[PDB]
Amino acid sequence: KTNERPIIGVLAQDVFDPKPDRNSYIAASYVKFLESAGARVVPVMINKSEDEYSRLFKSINGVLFPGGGVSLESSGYSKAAGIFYRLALEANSNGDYFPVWGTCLGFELLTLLTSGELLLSHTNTSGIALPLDFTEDVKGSRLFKEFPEELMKSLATEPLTENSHQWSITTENFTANKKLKKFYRVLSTNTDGYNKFVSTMEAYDFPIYATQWNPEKNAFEWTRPYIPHTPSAIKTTFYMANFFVNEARKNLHSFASTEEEEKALIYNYKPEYTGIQSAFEQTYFFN
Amino acid sequence: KTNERPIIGVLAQDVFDPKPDRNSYIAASYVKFLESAGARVVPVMINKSEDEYSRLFKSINGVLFPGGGVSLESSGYSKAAGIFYRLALEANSNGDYFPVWGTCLGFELLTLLTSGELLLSHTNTSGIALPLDFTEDVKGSRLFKEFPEELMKSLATEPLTENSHQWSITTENFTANKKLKKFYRVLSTNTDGYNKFVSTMEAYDFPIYATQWNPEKNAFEWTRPYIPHTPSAIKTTFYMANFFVNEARKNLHSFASTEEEEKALIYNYKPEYTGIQSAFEQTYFFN
Amino acid sequence: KTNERPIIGVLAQDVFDPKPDRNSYIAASYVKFLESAGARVVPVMINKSEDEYSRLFKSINGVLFPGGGVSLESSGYSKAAGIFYRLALEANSNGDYFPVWGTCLGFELLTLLTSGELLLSHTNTSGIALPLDFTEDVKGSRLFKEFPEELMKSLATEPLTENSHQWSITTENFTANKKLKKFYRVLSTNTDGYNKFVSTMEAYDFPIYATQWNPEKNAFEWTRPYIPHTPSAIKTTFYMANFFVNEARKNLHSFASTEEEEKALIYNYKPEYTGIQSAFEQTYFFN
Amino acid sequence: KTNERPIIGVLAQDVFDPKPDRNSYIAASYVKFLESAGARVVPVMINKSEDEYSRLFKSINGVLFPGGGVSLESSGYSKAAGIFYRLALEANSNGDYFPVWGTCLGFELLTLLTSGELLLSHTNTSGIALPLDFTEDVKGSRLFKEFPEELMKSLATEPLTENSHQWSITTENFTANKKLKKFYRVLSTNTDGYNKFVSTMEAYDFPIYATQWNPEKNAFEWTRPYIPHTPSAIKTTFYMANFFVNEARKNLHSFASTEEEEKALIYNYKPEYTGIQSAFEQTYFFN
Amino acid sequence: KTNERPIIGVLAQDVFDPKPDRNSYIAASYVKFLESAGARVVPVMINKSEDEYSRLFKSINGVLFPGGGVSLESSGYSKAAGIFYRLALEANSNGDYFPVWGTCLGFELLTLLTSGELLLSHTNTSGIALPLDFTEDVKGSRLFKEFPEELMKSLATEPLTENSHQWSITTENFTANKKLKKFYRVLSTNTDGYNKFVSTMEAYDFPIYATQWNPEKNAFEWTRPYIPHTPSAIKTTFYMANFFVNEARKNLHSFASTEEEEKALIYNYKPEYTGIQSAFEQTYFFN
Amino acid sequence: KTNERPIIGVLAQDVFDPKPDRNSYIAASYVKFLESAGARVVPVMINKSEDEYSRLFKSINGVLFPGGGVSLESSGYSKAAGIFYRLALEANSNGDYFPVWGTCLGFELLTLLTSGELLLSHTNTSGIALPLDFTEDVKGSRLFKEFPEELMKSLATEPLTENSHQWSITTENFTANKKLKKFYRVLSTNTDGYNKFVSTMEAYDFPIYATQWNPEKNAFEWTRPYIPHTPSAIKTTFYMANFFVNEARKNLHSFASTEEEEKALIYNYKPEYTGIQSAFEQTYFFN
Known part of the structure; x- marks a missing residue:
């Protein structure tokens, strides 16, 4: 029994010089990476409540922690990642397969x-x-x-x-x-x-x-x-990516509704063309 | 000699009830299809002159004609596709490998x-x-x-x-x-x-x-x-996609500078979330 | 020893947006289909006592369950056809030939x-x-x-x-x-x-x-x-239809009286012209 | 070349006791006769100009003069029949195949x-x-x-x-x-x-x-x-009936628009149940 | 044990001639009425899936079906209220107190x-x-x-x-x-x-x-x-309103997270001034 | 003789960091407080002439000085409230009941x-x-x-x-x-x-x-x-609030026309959701 509509979370991270609509960011290349292997993507926000993350954790089918240049110890990114890590260890220990x-x-x-x-x-x-x-x-x-x-x-x-x-x-x-x-x-x-x-x-x-x-x-x-x-x-x-997404296909979580699903997807966000200067062709910025 | 920075044109398509900022469109799934096999993408506009197309044709490495509902005979898309087809027959005839x-x-x-x-x-x-x-x-x-x-x-x-x-x-x-x-x-x-x-x-x-x-x-x-x-x-x-993009790697055209590439790439454009309604999760609309 | 005046029942069906005088329907084409092979036709109504249906079953010489867009479990139609089906299983194994x-x-x-x-x-x-x-x-x-x-x-x-x-x-x-x-x-x-x-x-x-x-x-x-x-x-x-009607000629039921027959026949009803905006040229609607 | 949507006219007939809403009739059996071989039917009205019949003749793919008890020399039925017979003799001679x-x-x-x-x-x-x-x-x-x-x-x-x-x-x-x-x-x-x-x-x-x-x-x-x-x-x-509709399939006449075709069909009319009294189960009465 | 932060749902209803951002409405007098008695309010949208309405049901602490001039059988409003009615009967029968x-x-x-x-x-x-x-x-x-x-x-x-x-x-x-x-x-x-x-x-x-x-x-x-x-x-x-909000205080549902709670509150919406015309001083319109 | 349509003034306040559209505010809980006891509210703007205030004062039926963090001596709020206070002592002394x-x-x-x-x-x-x-x-x-x-x-x-x-x-x-x-x-x-x-x-x-x-x-x-x-x-x-609106009911001022009253009412303004940051769920900002 596999989940053939897998949805994977990608973590946002703290932007070097923050400002409204620009507190965090995800490089589009991580979104593309997953989508190419047959997954849909949900950008996971930084500095949110623990209940919020377990809500998301119980709704998605995998999480990816991307590269970047942000503290491993006191960033929004590192806090969130730790919560996802612990949720994953626990879920998997109890037989709810969940790839990271x-x-x-x-x-x-x-x-x-x-x-x-x-x-x-x-x-x-x-x-x-x-x-x-x-x-x-x-x-x-x-x-x-x-x-x-x-x-x-x-x-x-x-x-x-x-x-x-x-x-x-x-x-x-x-x-x-x-x-x-x-x-x-x-x-x-x-x-x-x-x-x-x-x-x-x-x-x-x-x-x-x-x-x-x-x-x-x-x-x-x-x-x-x-x-x-x-x-x-x-x-x-x-x-x-194919391997990771086939791991996500073993997880059976879903969103509480298609409406909650649709509001969470990366499709609600448009990326900026940042390639003239950055290592990233395109990056998604979040409030 | 191959080209490992291939850039491929995807034709836009005339919109049903066309407004300003909304005369033509490319379904994002075609853009993603090419990128995932390691190409970059340039949208080819409708209703342009024979002159403008031959110049474009001379900078990109391949063209895709996408699906759609537009007319095979009297549409901007079909006029543009015939030009690219005639240009591609001629170029292949002269030892200039150009895939379609x-x-x-x-x-x-x-x-x-x-x-x-x-x-x-x-x-x-x-x-x-x-x-x-x-x-x-x-x-x-x-x-x-x-x-x-x-x-x-x-x-x-x-x-x-x-x-x-x-x-x-x-x-x-x-x-x-x-x-x-x-x-x-x-x-x-x-x-x-x-x-x-x-x-x-x-x-x-x-x-x-x-x-x-x-x-x-x-x-x-x-x-x-x-x-x-x-x-x-x-x-x-x-x-x-992999087969087609390897085909475009046999093509040696390029833009004249990186700033010209930058002017032309699909990265300049943001798609709308069109998936609740239409059959396409995301779509690029052009003036 | 045949019956050369066969009367076959055709099942009405729960309408979508039910009014008075418009609670169940039959498509005219099922009537014509049967008439053209030499049966008369009785419309079988939808929300009736098992006893009404047994009275009706003992009168007619066959039944037809027509196509439609109604539940196979919750509809009037499913209820009625269930009953006729089980009646017919009974009559047949008792040597009373009844076709469905x-x-x-x-x-x-x-x-x-x-x-x-x-x-x-x-x-x-x-x-x-x-x-x-x-x-x-x-x-x-x-x-x-x-x-x-x-x-x-x-x-x-x-x-x-x-x-x-x-x-x-x-x-x-x-x-x-x-x-x-x-x-x-x-x-x-x-x-x-x-x-x-x-x-x-x-x-x-x-x-x-x-x-x-x-x-x-x-x-x-x-x-x-x-x-x-x-x-x-x-x-x-x-x-x-010829086949099915010839099968109904093997069945010897009759209405208890010939005016109760007249009351039951499709002739009493008038179809509406529905072909402008349905799959059916004419439909009978019933209260 | 054939016509697989054959439309055939059936001549109406002067009513014996001529009330309004009841000036002419067609027995419903003639309609069934023809639909059952795969034709649609038009009721050809009784008291009408030579001009309105010519238009009808020119739209429809054949005609039927039914039985009845009206007079062969003085009735509308006899006038109309006479005009279609001559219209059809003429059309046939020009190679416009038209069956009567x-x-x-x-x-x-x-x-x-x-x-x-x-x-x-x-x-x-x-x-x-x-x-x-x-x-x-x-x-x-x-x-x-x-x-x-x-x-x-x-x-x-x-x-x-x-x-x-x-x-x-x-x-x-x-x-x-x-x-x-x-x-x-x-x-x-x-x-x-x-x-x-x-x-x-x-x-x-x-x-x-x-x-x-x-x-x-x-x-x-x-x-x-x-x-x-x-x-x-x-x-x-x-x-x-099969034989006659196949002859109608050789005729290529058509209506001028589809709203005009739609308006001329017997499906606009509803018959009365005349079985208890007359020889006709159902009869169409026209003004 | 009572809940002192009661959140109550108010059903939106179909707009008389619908446009984008104006498919449904809630009169603000319904919101004010509940708020005055110490409740916060969640607008419940009109054409949503059934899993969506349970998610919301399990989140809020009561529902109100407001006045209006919409159909009692075929409207968005009526379909939503039917589902909320059946959920509430079931929760009350299972010991989960839920007012309507x-x-x-x-x-x-x-x-x-x-x-x-x-x-x-x-x-x-x-x-x-x-x-x-x-x-x-x-x-x-x-x-x-x-x-x-x-x-x-x-x-x-x-x-x-x-x-x-x-x-x-x-x-x-x-x-x-x-x-x-x-x-x-x-x-x-x-x-x-x-x-x-x-x-x-x-x-x-x-x-x-x-x-x-x-x-x-x-x-x-x-x-x-x-x-x-x-x-x-x-x-x-x-x-x-006071009696009704005290009834909602006996229900112990909560949103999965503060962030979902914040997203569902009526605070996110601004009502239009409609009182020069309408019978309502202010009205909330929704897409 | 009471006024059963009482309209109460509420003082806006100098915004701590004034931007345009954002010079002054009223927390919406003061508007809701009065509406719930059956009044309509007029927001009293901050930097106006003494004559404007007289005009407003003669039209409305009461005033509220709300909470805030604005200087007691040198702010717009303090000035306007000064003026309203002096008008109110005058008016109540000359027999015209006006509560604060x-x-x-x-x-x-x-x-x-x-x-x-x-x-x-x-x-x-x-x-x-x-x-x-x-x-x-x-x-x-x-x-x-x-x-x-x-x-x-x-x-x-x-x-x-x-x-x-x-x-x-x-x-x-x-x-x-x-x-x-x-x-x-x-x-x-x-x-x-x-x-x-x-x-x-x-x-x-x-x-x-x-x-x-x-x-x-x-x-x-x-x-x-x-x-x-x-x-x-x-x-x-x-x-x-009930007590304070019953006092405003003893005041018989009214606007010179309805067009003027309608333009003054708080309904003309839409509040912002400031609950996440601020101590106020909703706040109204004026220029």
């Missing part, structure tokens, strides 16, 4: 929510397209199970994954942390020549997935020259 | 442009999801070369292609037309209970591709119970 | 009455003309015993049967019911491009006949373009 | 219109059902070409044709007339035991067909014990 | 909902101020228990209740219906000079209350000469 | 307008609900004369009056001021545990009434946990 996806900053947030500490160190990874150095553990993984063999090989040898991050967790700090090591299976790593860091992971016992790299950009973002756009880069971004 | 995709109405328009005739008849195909009945000719077709085998199989046996057309060409009428029989390889057909009609085709000697059905819909439109949304339906929509 | 005919809705009613269950799925069959795809079982059948060979051939290949229905029982859902499989010989099947459903059937052990299609429209309704009116289409309507 | 059918009185009128004289004598054929004494000339005939053999065998041996006429033309009297010997071929005769009369005939060169008996009654009138009602009687009346 | 109030039109709706019949007749009551003719059963009675004695007397003898209704139920037709008689206790009656009608009632077993007169007009509407405005008419509108 | 109500800030202003001095001290009364500690002098009083005795008992023991003020006149500072002691009767007092202050007063010889607490809030403001909302709290709001 962490991209870049969202990955880092995940290390914090699960470990309870900040374990990040600096990496020369601000603007570089990389292959993935798979671990031996990818062989049984959930994330990469449905990927074509051909694409798996390309991903190992081709610069298909975009990194635009200043911070990482070294495999050493990740392995040194007991909460992380017990919880997450590491599927690939990368290095900048000195630092070896965790690049893709999935929880052992929860449908929680995270990449330090930004899978959504290969199809959808064109304004920086270290975004890969080869044919295999384009498939990589489809197949990642 | 026609969906539903676009497919019909293509029967008219290459045969010179209206050969359409009524079919019982306004709102059903269908498999494809592949012709023996698919086995070394271009369009399906890269589709996974398991996906080609699902598509032969599962209701994965959405049909919302009043009109079609029957195989019979197709085969009795010398120009069409000589110009297009037919890759699949369909039935409605009684009529047998052409559902997919590719030109033998030109990169011209056409579906009577609407592959953009599966991942992107949610307003009608006859739109398939299974996992293979989603992949179908990706591999169709 | 279900058209479209009536056909759908019959699957529910005899199975206990609602086993109907959606079909793309609202407004098409189709041949019949005869099962092998027609060769030994009763319904089609007297059709001329030439009409059987036309019916197999040409669009002679009008389909205007959203629901059908597929051949799968029919075969999996043990109750339906025991009771009814399947005479033809049809398709809609993807689903295969039961279009004509007769009871193995009872004079019970049913068509998902609407034979009465060919000769008598002119208001929709998917009504077939070729000459073989006209003959189809005649031969279908 | 005569029943009983209508038949008798046709002897008067095409010979110029009155040759009716008295026959004892008020109220008897007769078989048909077919001439050697049936073998070459249009009328019965499409009749099944077994039905031709039944009609020659079984009392399948209803006779309700005081008057006939004897065969002796038919032959001796130069104008009718040349114009009409005689398909059957009958005898009352000493007067041998023409019962069926068709024009050698024109679509004019005529019966002394009443085909329409078998299926549709129930008020007299000499109306045959056997299964073969029912079919005799369908095959007679 | 019907004014004028809404009183008329209640007789229909509980009897299943339209039992109303004309009375000369479009615009008069009236005393109330109390029945002997006011003496028990919930509705009037907290009213000051001096006010009960004023209400018995002074023109304090405004009547603006074409329709009423006579006491004779009320007593004759078995459902009404059993379910509603009649508290007051009135007469136009030839019909005695029920003017105030309350259910024996449910918190359902209804007035054929309009309590809310005395303090808040100033447009009409028959609206009473004396001190003791001002108190009447307060004591009526 | 001062709430909170308006009360504080009254202590200054009659003493000539600022006599306020700081009190710990920023957000609490208090009973009234009644003085011996209530038994005479005008204000409480129609209060149900039961309500008077609740107001003495039950936390029914919301205080939200930093300042108060101690009863010692009141007593010691000769102008205040002579001009006002003190109906109630309160303490914050240290300071004992005047909470309700009325003029001996004038219809000036004032409360240090906010009666309007109980029914109409839902933003703060120290606003009381018990049933007796709700009645307290009503009785207080």
Whole structure:
């Protein structure tokens, strides 16, 4: 029994210099990423009540924590994400399957929510397209199970994954942390020549997935020259999203009504063209 | 030499009861279909001069003729499509590889442009999801070369292609037309209970591709119970777009500068939420 | 020993926006269908005591449950046809030959009455003309015993049967019911491009006949373009009714008195001209 | 090229006791006779200019002169019939195929219109059902070409044709007339035991067909014990009407608009139940 | 245990000639009436799904069906109120106390909902101020228990209740219906000079209350000469709303979150000044 | 001779950060407070000439000085209220009954307008609900004369009056001021545990009434946990306004034309939803 009308939440985040109609934002490339794999999208607002979030949590079928440049510890984004994290652990523990996806900053947030500490160190990874150095553990993984063999090989040898991050967790700090090591299976790593860091992971016992790299950009973002756009880069971004959305298809929540559904969808919002200057072609701004 | 920054024009369509700010329109699902396979999009306006189109034609890498309800003979859309078709035949003839995709109405328009005739008849195909009945000719077709085998199989046996057309060409009428029989390889057909009609085709000697059905819909439109949304339906929509955008990568046109691109991209425009009413969740309206 | 003055009942049906004098209706075409094969017709009314219906049943020589847009469980129509159905099961196994005919809705009613269950799925069959795809079982059948060979051939290949229905029982859902499989010989099947459903059937052990299609429209309704009116289409309507009426000539009931007969007959009523804005040229409305 | 929406006119007739709202009538059996073979019917009114008839003639696809008891020389019915006969003779000669059918009185009128004289004598054929004494000339005939053999065998041996006429033309009297010997071929005769009369005939060169008996009654009138009602009687009346409407399908006339077509149909009129008193179950009365 | 922040729903109703942003309305006098007695108000929209109306039902603490001139059977308003009526009966039977109030039109709706019949007749009551003719059963009675004695007397003898209704139920037709008689206790009656009608009632077993007169007009509407405005008419509108808001204090529903609560309050809407014309000083219009 | 259509003025107040459209405000709970006792309200604008105020004053039937945070000495509010206060003493002295109500800030202003001095001290009364500690002098009083005795008992023991003020006149500072002691009767007092202050007063010889607490809030403001909302709290709001509108009913002013009265009324203005931020659910802004 699957849910073939999956709806996924994407978290908004605190805007660097806030003002009316501009307190938070979501980059359109995260919306496109999900929609391409057959999901509809609900922008989740920052600084809302806990009851509001459980309302939303019980209505949607998955959440994605996107990249960005906002505090892991005291932002609207980090508060909301923590609430979604806890709701997800609990729902899943009780057999209500509910997938959570962490991209870049969202990955880092995940290390914090699960470990309870900040374990990040600096990496020369601000603007570089990389292959993935798979671990031996990818062989049984959930994330990469449905990927074509051909694409798996390309991903190992081709610069298909975009990194635009200043911070990482070294495999050493990740392995040194007991909460992380017990919880997450590491599927690939990368290095900048000195630092070896965790690049893709999935929880052992929860449908929680995270990449330090930004899978959504290969199809959808064109304004920086270290975004890969080869044919295999384009498939990589489809197949990642496809896996996440097929995880969302195992969740059976729905909105209380079609009217509540319609009022929540990203379709009520129009994005701004921000590509002349930003890394983002288009961004959604919220009050 | 390929072009990994492909930009593809999608034709706008004359609005039923046209007002200022609202003379033509593109359903957003066509924009999303292209972007998801790694192209950028430029809307092609109606009622423009032959001069303006050839200049546009010289900057983009491909064109799509979308579905719609507009006239095949006397509309702004059909006048614009004939020009792009004649420009694309000529350019391909001069070693300038330029692909054309026609969906539903676009497919019909293509029967008219290459045969010179209206050969359409009524079919019982306004709102059903269908498999494809592949012709023996698919086995070394271009369009399906890269589709996974398991996906080609699902598509032969599962209701994965959405049909919302009043009109079609029957195989019979197709085969009795010398120009069409000589110009297009037919890759699949369909039935409605009684009529047998052409559902997919590719030109033998030109990169011209056409579906009577609407592959953009599966991942992107949610307003009608006859739109398939299974996992293979989603992949179908990706591999169709993926094929077409790889075709546009063989094209070496470009805009003259990045500021010209910026002036032209679909990013300059915001769509309206049209899904409560119409069959399109979102639509771009133009002056 | 036949009855050469057969009178057949036709069921009225709950109207949508009910007034006085306008609470139930019958489409004139069902009356004409029957008259043309040599029956007189009695309108069976909607909200009556089981005793009224048993009085009426003992008087007339057959019943027809006509197509419509009314519930298969909550309507006056469903209530009445339930009763007639069970009366007829009784009379027949007592050796009192009584025939029943279900058209479209009536056909759908019959699957529910005899199975206990609602086993109907959606079909793309609202407004098409189709041949019949005869099962092998027609060769030994009763319904089609007297059709001329030439009409059987036309019916197999040409669009002679009008389909205007959203629901059908597929051949799968029919075969999996043990109750339906025991009771009814399947005479033809049809398709809609993807689903295969039961279009004509007769009871193995009872004079019970049913068509998902609407034979009465060919000769008598002119208001929709998917009504077939070729000459073989006209003959189809005649031969279908001829059969049913010849079955009613085996039934020996009569009205207790000939003025009570006169009071019951369709002649007392006047149809309205409804063809400007309905599928039906003329409709009888009842209080 | 055929016309599959045939409209046929049925001539009204002067009422015997001529109140307003009741100046002319048509027996409802003639309407049923024709609709049952797939034609719509127009009532052609009694007291009208040669101009309004020409317009009607020019819109409609055939005519029927019914039986009745009105006068052949002085009634409106006789004037109107006379004008349509001449209108139709003319149209036929220009290759505008236009069929005329005569029943009983209508038949008798046709002897008067095409010979110029009155040759009716008295026959004892008020109220008897007769078989048909077919001439050697049936073998070459249009009328019965499409009749099944077994039905031709039944009609020659079984009392399948209803006779309700005081008057006939004897065969002796038919032959001796130069104008009718040349114009009409005689398909059957009958005898009352000493007067041998023409019962069926068709024009050698024109679509004019005529019966002394009443085909329409078998299926549709129930008020007299000499109306045959056997299964073969029912079919005799369908095959007679079938033949005539197919002739009407050769005519391409049309109404000028569809609101004018819509307004001229018998569906605008409601009949009265005249069964308890008269030979006609239902009769249409006009102003 | 009571709820001291009671939120009450007021049903909107279909506008007489609908336009965008003007499909339904609520007169602000209904909102003011409830607010004055210490409740907040939720406008309940007119053409919404059934899951929507339960979501709202489970959120608010009572409903009011207001006056108006809309259909009692086919309107948006009537469909909504039917659903809210059935929800409220069910919650009360399950121990969830939930009050319903019907004014004028809404009183008329209640007789229909509980009897299943339209039992109303004309009375000369479009615009008069009236005393109330109390029945002997006011003496028990919930509705009037907290009213000051001096006010009960004023209400018995002074023109304090405004009547603006074409329709009423006579006491004779009320007593004759078995459902009404059993379910509603009649508290007051009135007469136009030839019909005695029920003017105030309350259910024996449910918190359902209804007035054929309009309590809310005395303090808040100033447009009409028959609206009473004396001190003791001002108190009447307060004591009526006060009893009804105290009934809503026995219900313990709440919105899922403050943010949903804020979204549903009447505070989000601005009413138009309509009093130069309409009978209402101000009116809220909704899309 | 009373005025049964009383219209009451309400002072707007200098906005703390004045933008255009937004120079002054009135909290909507003051408008709702008066309407509920059966008055219509005129907002009295802030920066107007003394002649304009005379014109308004001669037209209306009373004025309220509401709460606020605006200077007592140099604001528009203080100026206009000065002017209204002087007009009112004149008018009441020349036999023309004209009442004044001062709430909170308006009360504080009254202590200054009659003493000539600022006599306020700081009190710990920023957000609490208090009973009234009644003085011996209530038994005479005008204000409480129609209060149900039961309500008077609740107001003495039950936390029914919301205080939200930093300042108060101690009863010692009141007593010691000769102008205040002579001009006002003190109906109630309160303490914050240290300071004992005047909470309700009325003029001996004038219809000036004032409360240090906010009666309007109980029914109409839902933003703060120290606003009381018990049933007796709700009645307290009503009785207080009831008394003040009955005083305005003794005043026979009226506007010069209806066109002028209609242009003055608060219905011309729409409030904004300010409940999320502000302590006021709704507020009216003027330019």
